[PDB]
């Protein structure tokens with residue numbers, strides 16, 4: 001029943017329904033033995049999911065002597081917490097405990113990419129490094145952010161500029177968390193799923209095109225007492241998620257510290273992050289990546305690398321899931337009331353892209369749905385980039 | 391003429407006289423090819439040594455097209471800079487350049503352990519990691535801090551609580567920097583040399599006992615125009631330094647992330663760091679380690695592990711170099727005018743020691759000069775520690 005996926009030579013990804021309720025606590029106490037467990041989550045999630053876990057935990061810790069402690073930290077939800085200040089706050093709190101959290105500490109990231117990125121980075125530098133596990137609660141985290149070990153905080157200048165590669169000891173993907181995920185967040189996560197399919201398999205991309213309606217309806221439907229939101233589409237949903245997770249695992253395993261191949265997971269992100277730096281926190285990450293994918297596909301077509309028919313196909317697939325495909329989208333306009341991305345500000349933000357080689361900007365170019373132009377991001381001239389943003 | 395030492399499977403340590411003047415710039419441009427070099431140093435050192443390097447640099451960069459840039463950052467000297475604030479300042483400055491410093495950036499740490507620790511930590515998390523090289527300018531850095539890859543900042547609660555293991559690409563040990571080192575700093579560095587000898591070789595320790603007078607006199611002597619401070623003792627000095635560097639390299643190579651053997655380099659540091667947290671910045675690191683070594687040797691004798699004659703021998707060797715051997719030392723008293731280390735405050739600081747296993751404090755115990763009790767720090771009861779501090 002539990003699907004296991006290996007990454008970087010270790011079988012650390014465990015995926016199934018109900019792992020949180022009756023699996024994680026027990027597995028932690030045995031595979032990640034420690035005297036101190038630190039749970040980091042945000043206030044939205046904390047109130048919904050920590051209770052049953054404290055219980056399951058005490059039940060399993062009782063067996064052990066001396067019994068391990070569980071310390072909980074609740075942070076403000078949203079991109080605002082991915083900051084230097086929040087990192088320092090969690091550190092100081094951990095160092096303040098009695099006794100202080102030491103190097104045997106096991107940190108638990110219970111949440112989406114904001115909590116995962118922040119918690120992973122704290123873990124990576126706490127007394128120079130402690131173990132942590134990821135428990136993704138959003139669709140975006142399950143399929144992308146919780147896997148791979150990249151952690152980071154933002155700064156006023158831009159996205160993920162300070163961080164570290166620090167692999168989690170375990171990654172628990174419990175599909176049950178999606179039951180309570182808001183519709184906008186769920187759609188936001190599909191952008192990474194679509195991105196992953198587009199750089200790896202025409203087939204998977206086709207599958208996403210064919211299940212759009214079915215998925216979107218289950219997500220927007222009103223659930224009656226007793227039934228589950230994804231009642232008749234669990235198999236479909238699980239397949240789409242594991243397909244994304246597996247491909248990411250293969251890529252991370254082949255180029256952990258991004259010397260080449262890993263650049264591909266950044267498709268749509270060169271333009272997407274430049275946009276996010278300006279529109280956050282009103283506009284989400286997946287929504288910015290969606291616009292970035294269309295713009296980067298256009299750039300590839302502009303360079304004679306990608307077919308125009310391919311671009312239209314990417315746009316319609318994104319539109320089919322409710323994701324924005326341009327800065328002129330209606331929502332973007334109202335949600336970012338009083339915010340505009342000028343071509344120059346965007347070009348400025350792109351000079352901060354971590355894939356850039358010195359002053360040369362690098363972008364992932366698709367030659368076809370499921371086929372990258374190269375197994376790395378390519379050098380593109382500023383002039384060419386400007387024409388696509390105009 | 392250039393002595394090379396391997397560490398962690400790489401020949402990265404280069405030691406000789408004059409490397410800074412006519413070796414580093416050229417070696418950087420060829421072995422650490424990049425468009426951006428960032429030099430971090432403090433104000434004391436900057437004014438003395440950066441000038442000739444800018445020159446040597448431009449001379450070697452000229453050959454290259456496009457020519458690489460050299461950006462210089464000058465920080466306030468002292469333990470005060472090893473802070474979160476200074477780390478954020480350097481990061482923001484680097485991200486503010488035009489164009490921004492990217493992932494090809496090569497950071498140069500020109501200074502002692504304060505600059506090395508801070509710069510190494512910045513490098514470790516900048517865009518998730520960039521290359522850096524160490525150019526130790528103090529005796530303590532040459533023989534200890536610049537080697538091994540441990541980086542960190544302090545917090546009000548204590549020493550090196552946040553940091554990372556990040557190995558430098560090169561380590562350049564230019565003995566010429568010692569010409570301008572203040573006497574107190576030089577003596578401060580001997581504490582790490584003595585510590586290294588005591589955990590590895592009775593012979594080396596003996597050598598240190600026999601050259602004390604000769605070394606101390608050269609260090610305190612008034613140098614005439616034209617002559618060098620270490621005129622007739624270069625061979626002696628070089629041997630003592632390389633002996634320390636080599637042993638550290640062996641240990642780091644055997645246990646990089648401190649799972650066991652590396653604990654040994656922390657001899658005198660369990661009590662030494664607890665003292666430093668209180669007496670810094672008035673009292674230096676080596677001075678605190680000196681007191682910590684005597685206290686930890688006493689603890690080992692208390693546990694029936696070390697001979698009393700061995701303790702006296704450690705005390706006399708430290709005294710012979712001018713290092714303090716107790717909190718009652720005259721200097722400590724006047725320099726820390728209005729500061730006292732109570733047994734409880736010290737015990738509190740020791741609960742934050744990174745070697746501790748959960749609530750169990752771990753200390754390195756010597757069974758004899760040159761012979762550790764175990765190849766790791768040992769668990770010691772609080773009661774036993776208290777009797778030695780009383």
Ligand SMILES: NC(=O)c1ccc[n+]([C@@H]2O[C@H](COP(=O)([O-])OP(=O)(O)OC[C@H]3O[C@@H](n4cnc5c(N)ncnc54)[C@H](O)[C@@H]3O)[C@@H](O)[C@H]2O)c1
Pocket residue numbers: 042044045077078079082111112113114115116117137138140141144145146147148149150151152159160177178179180181182185188284285
């Ligand atoms: N490290 C990586 O590899 C990586 C990969 C992609 C994206 N990211 C980062 O991920 C971040 C975005 O993450 P995200 O979209 O998961 O956002 P998030 O963590 O802020 O979670 C989205 C929202 O949903 C709430 N929520 C979470 N799970 C819920 C659940 N099951 N039920 C109800 N409410 C729930 C949260 O409180 C929050 O408000 C960005 O900062 C982005 O840069 C990082």
Ligand SMILES: NC(=O)c1ccc[n+]([C@@H]2O[C@H](COP(=O)([O-])OP(=O)(O)OC[C@H]3O[C@@H](n4cnc5c(N)ncnc54)[C@H](O)[C@@H]3O)[C@@H](O)[C@H]2O)c1
Pocket residue numbers: 432434435467468469472501502503504505506507527528530531534535536537538539540541542549550567568569570571572575578674675
């Ligand atoms: N990372 C490690 O493995 C490690 C190992 C041991 C000690 N340390 C850390 O090292 C730090 C202490 O380092 P330090 O004693 O080198 O101090 P430091 O870097 O502050 O330098 C000491 C002083 O000498 C000046 N100076 C440096 N080189 C000079 C030179 N050649 N000529 C003239 N003036 C010079 C500096 O400006 C400063 O004022 C502590 O913070 C300690 O925790 C870290």
Ligand SMILES: O=C(O)[C@]1(O)C[C@H](CP(=O)(O)O)[C@@H](O)[C@H](O)C1
Pocket residue numbers: 144147148150152159160192262263264265266269354
């Ligand atoms: O390598 C990865 O895992 C990513 O490219 C990492 C990026 C963030 P980065 O560009 O800051 O590395 C993320 O947004 C993307 O979805 C997946």
Ligand SMILES: O=C(O)[C@]1(O)C[C@H](CP(=O)(O)O)[C@@H](O)[C@H](O)C1
Pocket residue numbers: 534537538540542549550582652653654655656659744
């Ligand atoms: O492992 C090391 O290199 C050290 O033990 C590292 C410590 C600092 P740490 O106890 O913070 O690791 C240092 O002071 C000591 O001289 C050498």
Ligand SMILES: [Cl-]
Pocket residue numbers: 125515
């Ligand atoms: Cl940090």
Ligand SMILES: [Zn+2]
Pocket residue numbers: 192269285289
């Ligand atoms: Zn992303």
Ligand SMILES: [Zn+2]
Pocket residue numbers: 582659675679
């Ligand atoms: Zn030390």
